[PDB]
From Swiss-Prot:
Residues 235-548 are annotated as: Epoxide hydrolase. This is Bifunctional epoxide hydrolase 2. It comes from the Eukaryota. The N-terminal domain has phosphatase activity. The C-terminal domain has epoxide hydrolase activity. Residues 259-531 form the AB hydrolase-1 domain. Mg(2+) binds at D9, D11, D185. InterPro entries: AB_hydrolase_1, AB_hydrolase_fold, Epox_hydrolase-like, HAD-like_sf, HAD-SF_hydro_IA, HAD-SF_ppase_IA/epoxid_hydro_N, HAD_sf, PGP-like_dom2. Changing R103C: Decreased phosphatase activity; no effect on epoxyde hydrolase activity. Substrate binds at Y383. Inhibited by 1-(1-acetylpiperidin-4-yl)-3-(4-(trifl uoromethoxy)phenyl)urea (TPAU), 1-cyclohexyl-3-dodecylurea (CDU), 12-(3-adamantan-1-yl-ureido)-dodecanoic acid (AUDA), 1-((3S, 5S, 7S)-adamantan-1-yl)-3-(5-(2-(2-ethoxyethoxy) ethoxy)pentyl)urea (AEPU), N-adamantyl-N[']-cyclohexyl urea (ACU), 4-(((1S, 4S)-4-(3-((3S, 5S, 7S)-adamantan-1-yl) ureido)cyclohexyl)oxy)benzoic acid (c-AUCB), 4-(((1R, 4R)-4-(3-((3S, 5S, 7S)-adamantan-1-yl)ureido)cyclohexyl)oxy)benzoic acid (t-AUCB), 4-(((1R, 4R)-4-(3-(4(trifluoromethoxy)phenyl)ureido)cyclohexyl)oxy)benzoic acid (t-TAUCB) and to a lesser extent by 8-(3-((3S, 5S, 7S)-adamantan-1-yl)ureido) octanoic acid (AUOA). It catalyses: an epoxide + H2O = an ethanediol; (9S,10S)-10-hydroxy-9-(phosphooxy)octadecanoate + H2O = (9S,10S)-9,10-dihydroxyoctadecanoate + phosphate; 12-phosphooxy-(9Z)-octadecenoate + H2O = 12-hydroxy-(9Z)-octadecenoate + phosphate; 12-phosphooxy-(9E)-octadecenoate + H2O = 12-hydroxy-(9E)-octadecenoate + phosphate.
Length: 548
């Protein structure tokens, strides 16, 4: 009775415009008899060429000659002559290419799966061996990840509306007819489903079909707020391991193809902090490499403090590129990662295609002042003095991992921390709740991932990034006569009460062609506070500065 599974057609529902609709306009353009392309498309019926193509018996390249004869045969009966420029190859090439994803439909499908539905795609498709088959391959891959099953006609040897495929569909979904809703742009494909007892929605226009699907499922799909970008499931990611040197191996996650983009997280985060950026960046045509920085998660965490100074952390990232075969890579960082990528561009510009930083500005070294004096001359950086002593800051953060991350990963309007009274009060969480409320930015599952990551190597490694003030300062002073002249981007967050946008006001002195981005109502955790704006800024900057 109560629905539980949802099935979606591709051509006409999830993808628009349908191939039949582009074939109809072609009939109008070249002034053919109406429907002639569709009579040739459907010549022979269940024993014709198109059904042999839809069943995997022949490939698309094999079917085009058969479609050419059907058009010459159909044009002979209607007493007409096909133009001199008639090309079925070129006609379908434009149709397959013009087909885009119906985002209101896919977003509604995601909402159902989020609410606990089993989503699937049931489409009549073909084995595409065209030279331009990659265009259709990209489309399928980005739709496949959002559904539990993709049942293709040419893979199973069954086509709609043959009843055998619907019995195969119900077996795949492991559900009864009256528990499944099925959407298709063709009414013929619904009669066998409507006979087995499943709910049917004829999709003519998307917003009306969504109104019907709202009613039968009891879930609001239309006029739903803007959904978050696609997140990452760790157990479905490609996990990579590179040994940059003895006792030091770096763990990273990889997705997509194209120019290598290397993401560097901050303190106290993980590769998972790019969960909203990784698919979005890979979809834009990039090979994302989200790192576990030295001392974090599955990466090595040697205890020595000097192993985390900026000079060592940068030489190892260069090595990481070497052992992977990458001459360059776009470096996007946040918090400590952002500071590391600034010095990557300053010391190894030949290995940085482009550099970008979230929140963290490039503050050049002061040759006449130690960094400890400057940190003391700023009450917001007072927690960094508390971090200096080893073991002290570790005991507090490692005491209750759940409370630690729930008190940190909070929006700008949820803050329960006072970064300016840390050393005085003798702790970061002295005046914070023992069981803080779950922020709007992170679910309980996402918090429990960070907990499991930091159960590995603790907080010693991460905190050691703070404990190389004098070493990093001596190193940076060697680059005081340089200038960053590669593509650079500085993204500032309005409500970051520690890395304020005003700290970046002088950066153009050192980066003349610096580009900028600003995100409003955004706290420190830029990636998970405003992921849709982070994705927009980066994909726009990458497409114009990093790619060729
Ligand atoms: C050469 O002059 C400097 C040089 C340098 C530094 C300062 C300098 O003076 C100009 C400081 C600056 C700095 C600032 C922030 C961070 N980020 C960070 O610690 N993030 C963790 C975190 C953030 C917010 C939190 O609170 C809440 F969660 F939002 F609530 C809790 C934790 C890093 C650095 C790097 N430093 C050394 C270099
Ligand atoms: Mg269709």
């Amino acid at each position: 009775m109560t629905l539980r599974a949802a099935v979606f057609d591709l051509d006409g529902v999830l993808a628009l415009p349908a191939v039949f609709g582009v074939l109809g306009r072609t009939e109008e353009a070249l002034a053919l008899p109406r429907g002639l392309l569709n009579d040739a498309f459907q010549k022979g019926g269940p024993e014709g060429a198109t059904t042999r193509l839809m069943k995997g018996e022949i490939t698309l390249s094999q079917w085009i000659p058969l479609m050419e004869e059907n058009c010459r045969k159909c044009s002979e009966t209607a007493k007409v002559c096909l133009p001199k420029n008639f090309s079925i190859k070129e006609i379908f090439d434009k149709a397959i290419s013009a087909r885009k994803i119906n985002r209101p439909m896919l977003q509604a499908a995601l909402m159902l799966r989020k609410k606990g539905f089993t989503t699937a795609i049931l489409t009549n498709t073909w084995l595409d061996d065209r030279a331009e088959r990659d265009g259709l391959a990209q489309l399928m891959c980005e739709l496949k990840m959002h559904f539990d099953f993709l049942i293709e006609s040419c893979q199973v040897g069954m086509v709609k509306p043959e009843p055998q495929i619907y019995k195969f569909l119900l077996d795949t979904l492991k559900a009864s007819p009256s528990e499944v809703v099925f959407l298709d742009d063709i009414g013929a494909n619904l009669k066998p489903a409507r006979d087995l007892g499943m709910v049917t929605i004829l999709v003519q226009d998307t917003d009306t079909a969504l109104k019907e699907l709202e009613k039968v499922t009891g879930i609001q799909l239309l006029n739903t707020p803007a959904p978050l970008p696609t997140s990452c499931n760790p157990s479905d990611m490609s996990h990579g391991y590179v040994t940059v040197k003895p006792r030091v191996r770096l763990h990273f996650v990889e997705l997509g193809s194209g120019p290598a983009v290397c993401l560097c997280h901050g303190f106290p985060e993980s590769w998972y902090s790019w969960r909203y950026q990784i698919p979005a960046l890979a979809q834009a045509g990039y090979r994302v490499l989200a790192m576990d920085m030295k001392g974090y998660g599955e990466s090595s965490a040697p205890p020595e403090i000097e192993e985390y100074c900026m000079e060592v952390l940068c030489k190892e990232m260069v090595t990481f590129l070497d052992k992977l075969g990458l001459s360059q890579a776009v470096f996007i960082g946040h918090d400590w990662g952002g500071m590391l990528v600034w010095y990557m561009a300053l010391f190894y510009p030949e290995r940085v295609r482009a550099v970008a930083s979230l929140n963290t500005p490039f503050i050049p070294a002061n040759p006449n002042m130690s960094p400890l004096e400057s940190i003391k001359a700023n009450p917001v950086f007072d927690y960094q003095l508390y971090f200096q002593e080893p073991g002290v800051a570790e005991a507090e953060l490692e005491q209750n991992l759940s409370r630690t991350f729930k008190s940190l990963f909070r929006a700008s309007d949820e803050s329960v921390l006072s970064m300016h009274k840390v050393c005085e009060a003798g702790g970061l969480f002295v005046n914070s709740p023992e069981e803080p409320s779950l922020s709007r930015m992170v679910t309980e599952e996402e918090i429990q991932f960070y907990v499991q990551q930091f159960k590995k190597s603790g907080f010693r490694g991460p905190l050691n990034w703070y404990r190389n003030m004098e070493r990093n300062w001596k190193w940076a002073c060697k680059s005081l006569g340089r200038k960053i002249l590669i593509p650079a981007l500085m993204v500032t967050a309005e409500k970051d009460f520690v890395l304020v946008p005003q700290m970046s006001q002088h950066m153009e002195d050192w980066i003349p062609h610096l580009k900028r981005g600003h995100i409003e109502d955004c706290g420190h955790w830029t990636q998970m506070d405003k992921p849709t704006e982070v994705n927009q800024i980066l994909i726009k900057w990458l497409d114009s500065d990093a790619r060729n």
